[PDB]
């Protein structure tokens with residue numbers, strides 16, 4: 001592949017995904033997304049080799065609920081990622097449109113997430129920030145994980161390992177908590193610990209302090225409460241999520 | 253214990269450790285450190301219960317290379333930690349004094365660190381930021397771990413679990429990297445990836461880009477290089493550190 005193989009169209013995501021463009025492969029007329037990475041920025045961050053490792057794994061993955069990397073190429077000053085285009089936009093945008101999701105839509109999205117995340121763990125695929133703005137929607141409305149782009153909260157910089165500074169610390173126990181947050185946000189319209197100030201959000205997370213609105217059913221409450229456990233080892237696993245009665249009863 | 257049992261003296265650490273004071277138990281004349289925590293700040297951070305869990309474990313620990321918590325008490329607006337006083341100050345201060353440490357001093361400190369960290373892992377003791385300013389020195393010059401006080405680097409706040417926001421992500425693989433950084437800093441006088449800007453330090457960590465000065469011996473180079481591995485699973489374990497020939501040859 002070369003740059004000349006593509007017609008570059010409108011920018012996508014208002015910069016939330018980096019320099020990404022709607023594109024068309026000139027000979028096949030196939031619609032896709034092209035992400036442009038600047039070598040100078042990759043070099044200044046020291047991530048060139050980490051990028052190569054991640055894209056090598058991704059280019060071999062195929063899963064209906066993970067955004068596909070079809071391939072990649074480079075020139076003198078840029079690296080180009082050939083990505084699947086999700087025509088229905090982000091789950092964030094859908095949530096904005098509907099205010100909140102019904103139990104069917106939610107349980108279906110949670111199943112797709114649990115499947116995508118399980119697959120990522122088994123294939124050793126790093127993902128970075130599970131949130132509605134990073135979840136995309138395919139032609140049939142199927143959810144696709146797309147969270148692959150990239151004193152501190154982990155301590156002092158000079159002493160921190162690569163996995164901390166490269167955002168590679170979302171393991172399966174972390175993801176379990178994220179899935180509870182997402183389940184709640186899908187049904188309610190906001191994440192459970194949301195507050196005006198960062199300080200107050202911190203407090204609510206640490207205390208696991210949240211309330212269900214009246215419309216949230218007993219089955220959904222059970223699932224969410226069993227995921228949002230302060231103790232990581234006590235959180236309901238991805239396999240157990242897929243077997244939960246509320247998920248079984250409501251998933252398409 | 254009550255506040256009235258103690259004479260409170262000079263503040264310690266220039267605020268780097270919070271509100272900490274040199275103190276004396278009035279009846280026994282025993283010298284110790286008293287740390288004052290304000291309930292209002294604990295409550296605003298949502299950490300009251302996490303504090304209780306951590307101090308319960310600590311109050312039962314005894315190890316020559318871990319700073320001891322003798323006990324604790326509270327009143328209407330404060331929590332008080334009764335801590336061991338380390339009379340020789342921080343390893344940071346010692347490094348400032350000497351510029352760099354010889355192989356004997358370094359290997360001895362690394363052994364004490366590896367012992368302290370091993371014990372922490374086995375007893376499930378959370379520690380937060382391994383660096384010279386957080387390492388203290390006892391009456392005989394023995395090293396004591398004291399790192400127990402507390403968009404992001406881990407992603408978006410609303411979706412992050414308690415273990416990320418509470419600084420509880422330093423597991424044994426993270427600690428292995430930290431131990432390599434410390435070994436280098438002890439021998440050289442600065443950590444290996446130190447640079448004027450945060451961006452450049454990030455780059456050097458991600459690339460694992462560092463150089464040994466000529467005076468660093470083959471055995472020390474081997475130890476450091478086997479700890480500073482980009483891949484976490486490839487780092488030399490704490491048991492293997494204690495068995496390393498350079499450590500055996502030089503540790504007191």
Ligand SMILES: COc1ccc(C(=O)Nc2ccccc2)cc1NC(=O)CCSCc1cnc2[nH]ccc2c1
Pocket residue numbers: 012013017018020033035037047050051054058067068069081083084085086087088089090136146147148149150
């Ligand atoms: C598989 O995907 C990715 C693979 C790799 C990277 C990446 O940047 N890796 C990296 C960079 C530097 C250092 C290390 C690693 C990013 C993505 N994915 C995205 O960036 C989000 C979708 S952009 C496309 C897209 C599609 N369909 C849409 N529909 C609406 C908006 C939209 C936007």
Ligand SMILES: COc1ccc(C(=O)Nc2ccccc2)cc1NC(=O)CCSCc1cnc2[nH]ccc2c1
Pocket residue numbers: 264265269270272285287289299302303306310319320321333335336337338339340341342388398399400401402
């Ligand atoms: C075992 O130790 C600790 C136990 C608990 C905590 C803590 O704050 N926990 C916490 C707080 C809020 C939420 C959750 C958890 C801190 C320490 N340790 C220190 O704070 C550093 C040494 S202060 C004493 C000391 C001694 N000896 C010195 N020599 C020179 C200076 C100096 C300074």
